[PDB]
Motif scaffolding. Structure first.
Motif, PDB file in Angstrom:
ATOM      1  N   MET A  27      -1.324  15.568   0.358  1.00  0.00           N
ATOM      2  CA  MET A  27      -2.200  14.961   1.359  1.00  0.00           C
ATOM      3  C   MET A  27      -3.582  14.671   0.784  1.00  0.00           C
ATOM      4  SD  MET A  27      -1.224  16.890   4.910  1.00  0.00           S
ATOM      5  CE  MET A  27      -2.621  16.131   5.709  1.00  0.00           C
ATOM      6  N   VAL A  67      -7.989   2.311  -1.959  1.00  0.00           N
ATOM      7  CA  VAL A  67      -7.535   1.067  -1.346  1.00  0.00           C
ATOM      8  C   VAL A  67      -8.658   0.423  -0.545  1.00  0.00           C
ATOM      9  CG1 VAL A  67      -6.024   0.100   0.458  1.00  0.00           C
ATOM     10  CG2 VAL A  67      -5.074   1.663  -1.309  1.00  0.00           C
ATOM     11  N   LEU A  68      -9.471   1.241   0.119  1.00  0.00           N
ATOM     12  CA  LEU A  68     -10.478   0.712   1.024  1.00  0.00           C
ATOM     13  C   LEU A  68     -11.833   0.493   0.364  1.00  0.00           C
ATOM     14  CD1 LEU A  68      -9.588   2.849   4.157  1.00  0.00           C
ATOM     15  CD2 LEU A  68      -9.374   0.341   3.956  1.00  0.00           C
ATOM     16  N   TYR A  77      -4.947   7.560   9.031  1.00  0.00           N
ATOM     17  CA  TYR A  77      -4.477   7.296   7.678  1.00  0.00           C
ATOM     18  C   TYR A  77      -4.003   5.844   7.592  1.00  0.00           C
ATOM     19  CZ  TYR A  77      -1.713   7.890   3.401  1.00  0.00           C
ATOM     20  OH  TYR A  77      -1.161   7.746   2.153  1.00  0.00           O
ATOM     21  N   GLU A 108       2.801   2.042  -3.333  1.00  0.00           N
ATOM     22  CA  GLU A 108       1.956   2.655  -4.365  1.00  0.00           C
ATOM     23  C   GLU A 108       1.977   4.184  -4.279  1.00  0.00           C
ATOM     24  OE1 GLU A 108      -1.968   0.978  -4.457  1.00  0.00           O
ATOM     25  OE2 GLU A 108      -1.233  -0.873  -5.389  1.00  0.00           O
ATOM     26  N   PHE A 109       1.774   4.728  -3.084  1.00  0.00           N
ATOM     27  CA  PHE A 109       1.730   6.179  -2.963  1.00  0.00           C
ATOM     28  C   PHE A 109       3.117   6.811  -3.088  1.00  0.00           C
ATOM     29  CE2 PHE A 109       1.173  10.268  -0.779  1.00  0.00           C
ATOM     30  CZ  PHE A 109       0.154  10.764  -1.573  1.00  0.00           C
ATOM     31  N   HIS A 111      -6.001   8.108  -2.530  1.00  0.00           N
ATOM     32  CA  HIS A 111      -5.387   6.786  -2.633  1.00  0.00           C
ATOM     33  C   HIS A 111      -5.952   5.840  -1.583  1.00  0.00           C
ATOM     34  CE1 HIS A 111      -1.895   4.053  -1.448  1.00  0.00           C
ATOM     35  NE2 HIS A 111      -2.240   3.631  -2.651  1.00  0.00           N
ATOM     36  N   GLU A 112      -6.061   6.313  -0.338  1.00  0.00           N
ATOM     37  CA  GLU A 112      -6.629   5.486   0.722  1.00  0.00           C
ATOM     38  C   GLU A 112      -8.076   5.121   0.417  1.00  0.00           C
ATOM     39  OE1 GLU A 112      -7.307   7.531   4.323  1.00  0.00           O
ATOM     40  OE2 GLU A 112      -7.114   5.770   5.610  1.00  0.00           O
ATOM     41  N   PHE A 169      -4.267  14.387  10.491  1.00  0.00           N
ATOM     42  CA  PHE A 169      -4.343  13.519   9.320  1.00  0.00           C
ATOM     43  C   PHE A 169      -3.818  12.121   9.616  1.00  0.00           C
ATOM     44  CE2 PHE A 169      -1.814  11.726   5.875  1.00  0.00           C
ATOM     45  CZ  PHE A 169      -2.766  11.517   4.909  1.00  0.00           C
ATOM     46  N   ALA A 223      -3.191  11.593  -1.137  1.00  0.00           N
ATOM     47  CA  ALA A 223      -3.101  10.462  -0.218  1.00  0.00           C
ATOM     48  C   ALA A 223      -4.477  10.026   0.270  1.00  0.00           C
ATOM     49  CB  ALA A 223      -2.215  10.826   0.976  1.00  0.00           C
ATOM     50  N   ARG A 224      -5.355  10.987   0.571  1.00  0.00           N
ATOM     51  CA  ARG A 224      -6.705  10.619   0.985  1.00  0.00           C
ATOM     52  C   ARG A 224      -7.436   9.908  -0.144  1.00  0.00           C
ATOM     53  NH1 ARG A 224      -6.558  15.553   4.519  1.00  0.00           N
ATOM     54  NH2 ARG A 224      -6.579  16.699   2.531  1.00  0.00           N
ATOM     55  N   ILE A 252       0.830  -1.207   0.000  1.00  0.00           N
ATOM     56  CA  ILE A 252       0.000   0.000   0.000  1.00  0.00           C
ATOM     57  C   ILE A 252       0.866   1.260   0.000  1.00  0.00           C
ATOM     58  CG2 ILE A 252      -1.755   1.287   1.288  1.00  0.00           C
ATOM     59  CD1 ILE A 252      -2.549  -1.290  -0.312  1.00  0.00           C
ATOM     60  N   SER A 253       1.886   1.321   0.869  1.00  0.00           N
ATOM     61  CA  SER A 253       2.703   2.529   0.948  1.00  0.00           C
ATOM     62  C   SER A 253       3.532   2.732  -0.324  1.00  0.00           C
ATOM     63  CB  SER A 253       3.604   2.470   2.192  1.00  0.00           C
ATOM     64  OG  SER A 253       2.883   2.787   3.382  1.00  0.00           O
ATOM     65  N   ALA A 272       3.436  14.709   6.712  1.00  0.00           N
ATOM     66  CA  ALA A 272       2.082  14.214   6.933  1.00  0.00           C
ATOM     67  C   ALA A 272       1.809  13.968   8.404  1.00  0.00           C
ATOM     68  CB  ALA A 272       1.855  12.919   6.146  1.00  0.00           C
TER      69      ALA A 272
END
Ligand SMILES: O=C(O)c1ccccc1O
Ligand SMILES: O=C(O)c1ccccc1O
Lengths: 139, 139
Positions: free
Chosen positions: A105, A115-116, B6, A21-22, A111-112, B2, A108-109, A18-19, A40
């Motif tokens: 950021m 993922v979810l 996360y 990827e970002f 991307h999360e 954040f 990133a939100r 997961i990490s 972050a």
């Protein structure tokens, strides 16, 4: 096969995939992995100790200290004395650092969220709650 | 704040805290972290490619290759050609490696049992299933 259901191996692989990827996005925006984790983790925070920053960014404290040397030189963070104990140095993000990282950021939100999304709101919140409880028990 | 919710930060911190706990045990038994990850990932496995080993142990492939050089010198693993493609090297644990790691693996199962016991069987299996699904989607 032992490793297929061994929790520490599952956590480590999921976290890496997961990490990573970002990370490509972060670098395309001029951030190293550790710079991203520091900014972050400081965004929206009151000043925290160097040790707390090392814990939340999962970075060894001597590495964090060198990182902060250069990020403070670039005006992105500030170190400050603790108002009681001077064993302790505190650190905060500056306005310059926040403006540097806010677009990343948002990405990133997003991307999360991607993922979810296959897991649904219920399974996602369960996962986050369990991880939070584990951290608070083991830190 | 954040970082508090996360997912990648939660996964990375949980993984570091849980794995670091067992690392002290592994070293007391003469294993480095990477030696433990390699032998635990090969235990009970058919031969797997170097790339697969790098993925499951969350270790960069050039690092894994140097590690295997010395672990094969110590008789703990064996590299073998793929029976079709010779871009691919396969690797397996030897009987010597299995006997070296089996006690540590029992201690690892006990450690995992302790980590998961406060959450109960249902929450533990949910966590493992979610992590497994995430890995299989992202690998
Ligand atoms: O964290 C572990 O103990 C581990 C063990 C085997 C494979 C990958 C891992 O992260
Ligand atoms: O993996 C991340 O993106 C991350 C971000 C902030 C803090 C710790 C982390 O692992």
């Amino acid at each position: 096969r032992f490793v297929d259901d061994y929790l520490p191996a599952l956590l480590a692989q999921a976290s890496q995939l997961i990490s990573s990827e970002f990370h490509e996005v972060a670098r395309q925006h001029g951030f190293s992995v550790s710079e991203w984790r520091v900014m972050a983790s400081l965004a929206g925070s009151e000043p925290i100790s160097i040790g707390q920053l090392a814990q939340v960014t999962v970075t060894k404290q001597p590495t964090v200290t060198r990182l902060l040397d250069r990020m403070e030189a670039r005006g992105q963070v500030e170190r400050l004395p603790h108002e009681s104990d001077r064993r302790i140095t505190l650190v905060r993000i500056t306005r310059k650092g926040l403006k540097a990282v806010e677009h990343l950021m948002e990405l990133a939100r997003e991307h999360e969220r991607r993922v979810l999304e296959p897991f649904g709101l219920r399974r996602a919140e369960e996962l986050k709650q369990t991880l939070r409880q584990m951290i608070d028990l083991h830190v």
